[PDB]
Design an enzyme around this catalytic site. Structure first.
Site, PDB file in Angstrom:
ATOM      1  N   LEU A  22       5.131   5.437  -8.294  1.00 31.16           N
ATOM      2  CA  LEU A  22       4.278   4.259  -8.173  1.00 31.16           C
ATOM      3  C   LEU A  22       4.722   3.340  -7.042  1.00 31.16           C
ATOM      4  CD1 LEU A  22       4.178   3.541 -12.000  1.00 31.16           C
ATOM      5  CD2 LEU A  22       2.481   4.785 -10.655  1.00 31.16           C
ATOM      6  N   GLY A  25      11.161   1.288  -2.979  1.00 35.64           N
ATOM      7  CA  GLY A  25      11.836   0.370  -2.087  1.00 35.64           C
ATOM      8  C   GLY A  25      13.060   0.999  -1.454  1.00 35.64           C
ATOM      9  N   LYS A  26      13.970   0.137  -0.995  1.00 37.70           N
ATOM     10  CA  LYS A  26      15.192   0.618  -0.363  1.00 37.70           C
ATOM     11  C   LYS A  26      16.219   1.027  -1.414  1.00 37.70           C
ATOM     12  CE  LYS A  26      12.623  -2.227   0.572  1.00 37.70           C
ATOM     13  NZ  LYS A  26      12.102  -3.071  -0.545  1.00 37.70           N
ATOM     14  N   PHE A  27      16.401   0.190  -2.437  1.00 39.06           N
ATOM     15  CA  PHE A  27      17.360   0.436  -3.506  1.00 39.06           C
ATOM     16  C   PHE A  27      16.682   0.420  -4.874  1.00 39.06           C
ATOM     17  CE2 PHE A  27      19.555  -1.478   0.070  1.00 39.06           C
ATOM     18  CZ  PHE A  27      20.628  -0.627   0.262  1.00 39.06           C
ATOM     19  N   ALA A  28      15.404   0.786  -4.924  1.00 33.13           N
ATOM     20  CA  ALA A  28      14.680   0.834  -6.186  1.00 33.13           C
ATOM     21  C   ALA A  28      13.507   1.796  -6.060  1.00 33.13           C
ATOM     22  CB  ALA A  28      14.182  -0.557  -6.595  1.00 33.13           C
ATOM     23  N   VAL A  29      13.263   2.556  -7.127  1.00 37.75           N
ATOM     24  CA  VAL A  29      12.133   3.470  -7.210  1.00 37.75           C
ATOM     25  C   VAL A  29      11.448   3.251  -8.551  1.00 37.75           C
ATOM     26  CG1 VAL A  29      11.349   5.864  -7.173  1.00 37.75           C
ATOM     27  CG2 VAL A  29      13.267   5.158  -5.725  1.00 37.75           C
ATOM     28  N   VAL A  30      10.127   3.398  -8.558  1.00 39.72           N
ATOM     29  CA  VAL A  30       9.324   3.236  -9.765  1.00 39.72           C
ATOM     30  C   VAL A  30       8.567   4.538  -9.985  1.00 39.72           C
ATOM     31  CG1 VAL A  30       7.684   1.796 -11.012  1.00 39.72           C
ATOM     32  CG2 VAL A  30       9.092   0.800  -9.188  1.00 39.72           C
ATOM     33  N   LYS A  45      11.473   1.549 -13.662  1.00 38.95           N
ATOM     34  CA  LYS A  45      12.045   1.075 -12.406  1.00 38.95           C
ATOM     35  C   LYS A  45      13.534   1.407 -12.407  1.00 38.95           C
ATOM     36  CE  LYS A  45      11.867  -3.417 -10.562  1.00 38.95           C
ATOM     37  NZ  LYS A  45      11.745  -4.315  -9.373  1.00 38.95           N
ATOM     38  N   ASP A 141       8.418 -14.215  -4.130  1.00 38.40           N
ATOM     39  CA  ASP A 141       7.883 -12.976  -3.574  1.00 38.40           C
ATOM     40  C   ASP A 141       6.462 -12.724  -4.069  1.00 38.40           C
ATOM     41  OD1 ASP A 141       8.482 -11.114  -1.649  1.00 38.40           O
ATOM     42  OD2 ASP A 141       9.403  -9.675  -3.030  1.00 38.40           O
TER      43      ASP A 141
HETATM   44  N1  LIG Z   1       4.682  -1.878 -14.081  1.00 40.62           N
HETATM   45  C1  LIG Z   1       4.140  -1.267 -13.019  1.00 40.62           C
HETATM   46  N2  LIG Z   1       3.019  -0.527 -13.162  1.00 40.62           N
HETATM   47  C2  LIG Z   1       2.509   0.069 -12.061  1.00 40.62           C
HETATM   48  N3  LIG Z   1       3.019  -0.012 -10.846  1.00 40.62           N
HETATM   49  C3  LIG Z   1       4.137  -0.740 -10.658  1.00 40.62           C
HETATM   50  C4  LIG Z   1       4.723  -1.385 -11.748  1.00 40.62           C
HETATM   51  N4  LIG Z   1       5.813  -2.038 -11.299  1.00 40.62           N
HETATM   52  C5  LIG Z   1       5.915  -1.813  -9.969  1.00 40.62           C
HETATM   53  N5  LIG Z   1       4.890  -1.019  -9.567  1.00 40.62           N
HETATM   54  C6  LIG Z   1       4.674  -0.590  -8.315  1.00 40.62           C
HETATM   55  O1  LIG Z   1       5.914  -0.421  -7.652  1.00 40.62           O
HETATM   56  C7  LIG Z   1       5.974  -1.226  -6.444  1.00 40.62           C
HETATM   57  C8  LIG Z   1       7.355  -1.780  -6.230  1.00 40.62           C
HETATM   58  O2  LIG Z   1       7.840  -2.295  -7.449  1.00 40.62           O
HETATM   59  P1  LIG Z   1       8.752  -3.683  -7.393  1.00 40.62           P
HETATM   60  O3  LIG Z   1       8.978  -4.216  -8.840  1.00 40.62           O
HETATM   61  O4  LIG Z   1       8.046  -4.709  -6.579  1.00 40.62           O
HETATM   62  O5  LIG Z   1      10.149  -3.347  -6.695  1.00 40.62           O
HETATM   63  P2  LIG Z   1      10.680  -3.620  -5.213  1.00 40.62           P
HETATM   64  O6  LIG Z   1       9.803  -4.693  -4.552  1.00 40.62           O
HETATM   65  O7  LIG Z   1      12.091  -4.088  -5.275  1.00 40.62           O
HETATM   66  O8  LIG Z   1      10.596  -2.322  -4.377  1.00 40.62           O
HETATM   67  C9  LIG Z   1       4.973  -2.356  -6.701  1.00 40.62           C
HETATM   68  O9  LIG Z   1       4.460  -2.862  -5.475  1.00 40.62           O
HETATM   69  C10 LIG Z   1       3.895  -1.633  -7.509  1.00 40.62           C
HETATM   70  O10 LIG Z   1       2.985  -0.993  -6.614  1.00 40.62           O
END
Ligand SMILES: Nc1ncnc2c1ncn2[C@@H]1O[C@H](COP(=O)(O)OP(=O)(O)O)[C@@H](O)[C@H]1O
Ligand SMILES: [Mg+2]
Length: 272
Positions: A22, A25-30, A45, A141
């Protein structure tokens, strides 16, 4: 280093991952995951505990503390569980099927979002920010990438995410930066209100108000509050909406209305 949260073995026992990423990021994946008990979809996350050689476990605990504080608020994403392994802390979040609100800011979907729909989404985004501001929390943010929708067909509800930069009042992408950030002036709740002006500007016009050819022109437009309010861009946007945005896109933070006042703007009053 010892693990505080549940073990990774429990995660693999209750949840299954999918191939669906979904966000990254640099140090995070969803990634998307499903509960083996209920088949419900959740968002996982994965956050790295070491960023640039620094043990950042404390900041992740800070982001968990904030999510936990705003659980009662439905405009904020819900945190269900937390797991941890050697290098990662895992947050099981309520799934937002609609995706980023950034999608509606593109001309490719301008044909299905009416002004009446933006009024509803803007009203929802404010109720969440109001709650956060009631508790001395500032997001910092509030960009369309960190505001999601519960659905899209039909348009769902707002769900705010990404609290990696949430601090308390009076603490220490370019196009979404406020002008008081460039002056180094202290943070303030009004900083989040500048970003709400951009969200509304981006939804109604489908263009960013400050991005230029290069970053130099971007920063200049921000520090000068040089926004395109021409008739060509607002020919099909109500004047109330314009009054709403201009009241927020001003250089002086103390002049911007609060989240409470914004809910009283004549533009957001109408039986829906
Ligand atoms: N609960 C969620 N359901 C669906 N998509 C999500 C969810 N949380 C994050 N995402 C997706 O992941 C992307 C990055 O997540 P985020 O929490 O902003 O971490 P980061 O900004 O540190 O990379 C978001 O822009 C969104 O598109
Ligand atoms: Mg993000």
């Amino acid at each position: 280093e010892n693990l505080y949260f549940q073990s990774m073995e429990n995660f693999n026992n209750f949840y299954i991952l999918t191939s669906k990423e979904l966000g990254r990021g640099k140090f995070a994946v969803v990634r998307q995951c499903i509960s083996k008990s209920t088949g419900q979809e959740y968002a996982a996350k994965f956050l790295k505990k070491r960023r640039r050689g620094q043990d950042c476990r404390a900041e992740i605990l800070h982001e968990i503390a904030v999510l936990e504080l705003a659980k009662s608020c439905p405009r904020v994403i819900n945190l269900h569980e937390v797991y941890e392994n050697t290098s990662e802390i895992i947050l099981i979040l309520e799934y937002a099927a609609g995706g980023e609100i950034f999608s509606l800011c593109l001309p490719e979907l301008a044909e299905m979002v009416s002004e009446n729909d933006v009024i509803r989404l803007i009203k929802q985004i404010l109720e969440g920010v109001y709650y956060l501001h009631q508790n001395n929390i500032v997001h910092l943010d509030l960009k369309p990438q960190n505001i999601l929708l519960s659905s899209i067909y039909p348009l769902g509800d707002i769900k705010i995410v990404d609290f990696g930069m949430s601090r308390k009042i009076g603490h220490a992408t370019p196009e979404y930066l406020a002008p008081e950030i460039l002056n180094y002036d202290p943070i303030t709740t009004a900083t989040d209100m500048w970003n709400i002006g951009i969200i509304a500007y981006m939804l109604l016009t489908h263009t960013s108000p400050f991005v230029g050819e290069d970053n130099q022109e971007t920063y200049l437009n921000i520090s000068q509050v040089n926004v395109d309010y021409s008739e060509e861009t607002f020919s099909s946007v109500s004047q109330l909406a314009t009054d709403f945005i201009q009241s927020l896109l001003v250089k002086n933070p103390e002049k911007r209305p609060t989240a409470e006042i914004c809910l009283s703007h004549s533009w957001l009053q109408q039986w829906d």
